[PDB]
Symmetry: D2
Subunit: 262 residues, 4 copies
């Protein structure tokens, strides 16, 4: 059940938040927003040096505390240890923002089973491992899981087959456990974010020169993700066009799920 | 692009078809329908003894030829080598029916990463491996890939989280490469089948005392899958209720896809 | 612009309301609800005898005032004069509830053009005439027009062709003038009510078989209409099934209208 | 049931067709198309002068025959007698194209009950009278009724209240009788056409200085109406934008009607 409330930045004051993939792009922007809101933040990515810079800026911005732990989410042991360590750094966990992805570019699928497996491991499986590791703390705090996804996680696009598979998988998994938490009375919210083109360096390099579309600002995108998580909304849609978000909705699916539950 | 005509059993006559997970349930029924249609079939599953029975019955029903290769789709090497061997046995491949799943029951996700992993490997990754292995032959024959999926591969259900993840992944992956084949002029069709409750032994055991819904017959289900694949349809929907099929359709998704291209 | 508040029965206290087709069915129930709420009510229909009973009970229920004026809405002069009289009697008008229909039973269209014409005159044209007559008073009070319509005013059914024409016409006309009031800054709300099967005597005599049991209570129906009107809602949907109310919604239409609104 | 076939111009060859409001605009274009297809045509409108010109061009184009009968559809007696005359002229009737409207311009509704009644009489009631007169002949030929309507006959627009009421009425009436013909096994098709902005002189004059949108060609509009009628389609949608035609569809209504039919 989502909060029938207007979002206020104070909702994140003193909250203990993990942000993954936070060295750049949307993840970094989320860290910065949370810092401005006075959250405790633990950020992760592979890039130790840029993560320290992100942390330093978070402290400048007014984070209650800020730490980084560097590692690759290809490593499921790292994922497990990271959450345990992050929990100790903050003295608990209120929000788990899962945002990282493995390197993805626009290319036709040509026998690249390696990339399919890697995308599944980093983009999907690690999210599951992180969640399992975080759940005890999240149950303690009646916390929130925020899963960052994509238009390519709701509809099919050429050139992102492996990526799409992993993002669709996130939808299937996390939407299913959401239904389980509802019936099990587990007070942990799950927010799935569906993003259009966002003006991160990664996206801008990737779509040049294949796609020529309006890119939404990464700062606003980051805020909207946090907002949705804070308000415990089931899904967050963010795109430069309001008419895109109208097309992402799937009431037919909602009806089928409603009919099953009752 | 689907064939603008009604289905005839003669469409499968002499066609070279792989059916995975064909020792029982829908897979077995598909093998039987294909045999009745006079197709060449190679069936696979883990149990050689039960596959032997299927092959024997396939030849009785009038299969052009029938062979089994036994093994687990947990083994990606087996998946790759199976397709090559199946293709060798038949002298090519017209249709790849991907149907197998790892054993799944209705249970809460209780930090079962091992089941999530196994579901992703068997239900999804092996389908990709099998496809990669089969594609050269399918490109030669302008053939078809048929991916068996589920209502839980289109909408969310409690108690099947790992399974749902794997089936959602199939939609994402196979629907994406379908778009790729359309723009790359690859004349291999991809059919995704979305099934409601089907009266297989597995399903009836799994839902016993938990879900009380009417089950659709496995025989007709199997036929509808084959029909859709033969007709090169993008998606096949099979459920005991017609209203279910209406609610699984996603025109909004199709619009978004059309707008992209 | 609807009122962003919960309905209170006190919203109708001392309000001056006309209800047409109010001798029986939903109309009578509406008069009774308004009476209970302490409204001033003027009711109309052709039969003085039945209207007298409605007025008597309205007073008993606690109407601030209750009166009838009898006549046929086949007569556009009566329609016009009725509103003027009712308004003068009450000293204004806050709500105009348009509810009357000409007698309709379920039959195949059988070249009865006379019935098509009568349906259009009584069910549609008189509503327009009553509206024109009422508008000056409604503008003064920032009041409301409530137009009672039907499932057969949003979707097609056999056996009610003439009636459907008239109810569809109400939608086209009143939804258009609503758009006009929005841009002309006319502070009079228009509420179109879409009703499924309601257990009025007329409906129960008309319909056949088990469908009778799916009839919604006329008492609750009448209240929901008043609520919608009081809250200045654009549309009220009332049916015994929530799935029906889902299927009468037309967001596609709403989008086309929104896109035009600034064009 | 619509014809499971692609349209061929030969489908109208030798067919006996009435077109109302055919002195100009879409009606005139329809007459011209039918003429080219070698149909028998009877055209009507108030102006004999303009009708004569249409007839002359129809004969030029190769109509099997072409006649006009002038009169006002405000007059229900004329409406009825016109159909009898037209049927006598052609020796029967295969298609009745109901297209005429009373003069309508964009204006706020201001006590003009006279105009509301006139719109209802000409735009709606006359269509019913014409249908009643034509039905015996149409039953004999397993013929077709084509009712020309409007976006303002499916959605609400300001400035066309009286017109909208009349076009909505056509939908309510003719869609109801279509259901009646199905259950009564009357083999006469009813086609309701929903038109966006069409570049007729009337439309171009009316929208001048108030609406700025793409106008669809009247010739193609006319053809699509004829095609839909010939193929016994329930509805024809014609607009400059295909997205408009998507927004005019009402599947929910179709479901409600299907459920009642069951
Ligand atoms: N930008 C867009 O247009 C869209 C974005 N999205 C989504 O939003 C999210 C963020 O995208 P965006 O900000 O554009 O991506 P970026 O590439 O900017 O950021 C991805 C981050 O994840 C990290 N990462 C990469 N590999 C690994 C690894 N093996 N282990 C841990 N972290 C890794 C990166 O840091 P480092 O390299 O240091 O490890 C990087 O901080 C993604 O989930 C994506 O799916 C969805 C649709 C569109
Ligand atoms: N029945 C239903 O209600 C529904 C079915 N479906 C779908 O239809 C498909 C078939 O379902 P159903 O017939 O019920 O399933 P069954 O259990 O009847 O059959 C699954 C088959 O796959 C094989 N299999 C199991 N594990 C493995 C493995 N590691 N490697 C290779 N093969 C394995 C089995 O043979 P063996 O054990 O011998 O190996 C078995 O023949 C599934 O893809 C499923 O997702 C979807 C929704 C509902
Ligand atoms: N009940 C239902 O299932 C449904 C009802 N509706 C709608 O709700 C409204 C009320 O329906 P319901 O309560 O069933 O109708 P009723 O038959 O119960 O009441 C109709 C009223 O209008 C009056 N009336 C009939 N002819 C005339 C006339 N010529 N001039 C003035 N009044 C006339 C009647 O009184 P008198 O005869 O004395 O004039 C009667 O008071 C109708 O607008 C209808 O369209 C819509 C869908 C379903
Ligand atoms: N053009 C557009 O943008 C749109 C058109 N439409 C629809 O398509 C139809 C044709 O429109 P369009 O071609 O623009 O219209 P036009 O104005 O060009 O033609 C209307 C015709 O009807 C006739 N007519 C007018 N009054 C009467 C009467 N009292 N009796 C008999 N005929 C009369 C006219 O001839 P005369 O004056 O000599 O009698 C004229 O031939 C209309 O039904 C309309 O509702 C719908 C939406 C948009
Ligand atoms: C830009 C496209 C298409 C988005 C879309 O379909 N958007 C709505 C449709 C808009 N319309 C066509 C309707 C109108 C446009 C009006 S406009 O004015 O814009 O021309 C989307 C679809 C899939 C997206 C990629 C994947 O996620 C993987 C990856 C994640 C990284 O993190 C960033 C890089 C990358 C490659 C992503 C970039 C971009 O995000 C992609 C290409
Ligand atoms: C929910 C409420 C309003 C719905 C939309 C509207 O219905 C209009 C439109 C009709 C098309 O047909 C299908 C797509 C579209 C965009 C709907 C999709 C979806 O269902 C919406 C967003
Ligand atoms: C709103 C919320 C759920 C929506 C409906 C459902 O989505 C199912 C269905 C999908 C088709 O596409 C169009 C018709 C239909 C009936 C929708 C129409 C409409 O939009 C509804 C009523
Ligand atoms: C039966 C349910 C729900 C299906 C559903 O939601 N169906 C539409 C409902 C229709 N309505 C509610 C609208 C009306 C009912 C009319 S009725 O008369 O039936 O009451 C579906 C949803 C997910 C399904 C399982 C997974 O796939 C995984 C696995 C695959 C194996 O291979 C077979 C076993 C197993 C466990 C599956 C069994 C079954 O298949 C499940 C439980
Ligand atoms: C009863 C039918 C159909 C209503 C409908 O289509 N209802 C939803 C569909 C229900 N399903 C089929 C889906 C089954 C669900 C069962 S469930 O148990 O879920 O409810 C409706 C449609 C048109 C209606 C008449 C007109 O107005 C004219 C007139 C007005 C008077 O004032 C009262 C009398 C009369 C004759 C009206 C009576 C009744 O009102 C009619 C026949
Ligand atoms: C032009 C407008 C609006 C139509 C509309 O809403 N059309 C699509 C949607 C527009 N969008 C904003 C969504 C896209 C535009 C993109 S665009 O690139 O085009 O600017 C429509 C709606 C009602 C129409 C009148 C009535 O029928 C009565 C009458 C019939 C005669 O016979 C011809 C004259 C007249 C006055 C008609 C002219 C015109 O026909 C009107 C004004």
């Amino acid at each position: 059940q989502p909060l029938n409330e207007e979002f206020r930045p104070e909702m994140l004051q003193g909250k203990k938040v993990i942000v993954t993939g936070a060295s750049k792009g949307i993840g970094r922007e989320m860290a910065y927003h949370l810092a401005k809101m006075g959250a405790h933040v633990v950020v992760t990515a592979r890039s130790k040096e840029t993560l320290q810079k992100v942390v330093s800026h978070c402290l400048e911005l007014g984070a209650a505390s800020a730490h980084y732990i560097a590692g690759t989410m290809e490593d499921m042991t790292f994922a497990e240890q990271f959450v345990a360590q992050a929990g100790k750094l903050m003295g608990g966990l209120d929000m788990l923002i899962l945002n990282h992805i493995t390197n993805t570019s626009l290319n036709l699928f040509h026998d690249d089973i390696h990339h399919v497996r890697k995308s599944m491991e980093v983009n999907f499986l690690s999210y599951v491992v992180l969640t399992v590791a975080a759940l005890p703390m999240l149950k303690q705090s009646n916390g929130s899981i925020v899963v960052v996804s994509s238009l390519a996680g709701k509809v099919a696009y050429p050139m992102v087959a492996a990526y799409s598979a992993s993002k669709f998988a996130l939808d299937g998994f996390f939407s299913s456990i959401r239904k389980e938490y509802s019936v099990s009375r587990v007070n942990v919210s799950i927010t799935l974010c569906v993003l259009g083109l966002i003006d991160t360096e990664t996206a801008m390099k990737a779509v040049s020169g294949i796609v020529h579309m309006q890119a939404a600002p990464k700062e606003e995108c980051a805020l909207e993700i946090i907002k949705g998580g804070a308000l415990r909304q089931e899904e967050v849609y963010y795109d430069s066009s309001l008419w895109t978000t109208l097309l992402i909705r799937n009431p037919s699916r909602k009806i089928l799920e409603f009919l099953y539950s009752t």
